[PDB]
Every structure is written in C-alpha cells, then in structure tokens.
C-alpha cells in the first residue's frame, strides 16, 4: 500500500508495489500552500531533474502522513 495526498479519505493506496510514494507539483510554499498541489502516484523512481516543481519520493509504503493542509492538517 502506499500514500498519496488526496485528502478525502486517508491516503494510502496503490498497493502494487513496492515502490514509493511520489508526490510532484508546482508550487510549494506560498502559492497554494494550503490545499494541495499535488499529484502523486505509485512511484517509479525520484530522480533529479526538476525545474521548479516540487518532487518528493520516499520508499516504504505509506511513507507519508503529510496530508498537510494548511498547516497540517
């Protein structure tokens, strides 16, 4: 199982692997720093090419609480 964001339910799905939680976005800090951002997936590698979008990956499962919201949470 894994994480995600989509704050609605909890946010630990896409079993498949094995893999990671990846969240990639746009902004992170002041633009919309209280929704969201973020598209996420069931990973497949966080490399190191990024312009301006915030990309985080972490192996594990659920990684992730960090639903964060507004502030947490």
């Amino acid at each position: 199982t894994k994480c995600y964001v989509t704050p609605d339910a909890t946010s630990q799905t896409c079993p498949d692997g094995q893999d990671i939680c990846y969240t990639k976005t746009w902004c992170d800090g002041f633009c919309s720093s209280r929704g969201k951002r973020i598209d996420l997936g069931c990973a497949a590698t966080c490399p190191k090419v990024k312009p301006g979008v915030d990309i985080k990956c972490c192996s594990t499962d659920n990684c992730n609480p960090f639903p964060t919201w507004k502030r947490k949470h």
Side-chain angles (χ1 to χ4, degrees):
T1 199
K2 171 260 292 169
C3 66
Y4 289 164
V5 302
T6 316
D8 222 61
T10 88
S11 303
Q12 41 189 113
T13 13
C14 210
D16 242 287
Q18 285 219 345
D19 279 340
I20 62 238
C21 266
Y22 118 99
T23 6
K24 173 275 299 253
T25 33
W26 241 63
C27 325
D28 200 73
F30 52 55
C31 86
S32 346
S33 63
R34 253 246 262 262
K36 179 194 202 144
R37 247 83 280 303
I38 319 159
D39 100 321
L40 38 90
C42 329
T45 335
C46 258
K48 17 270 208 303
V49 202
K50 7 253 164 285
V53 296
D54 221 75
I55 326 181
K56 49 221 276 96
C57 283
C58 62
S59 44
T60 301
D61 258 316
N62 302 335
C63 187
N64 302 176
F66 36 62
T68 110
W69 226 98
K70 123 174 175 67
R71 233 195 196 308
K72 305 91 97 96
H73 189 25

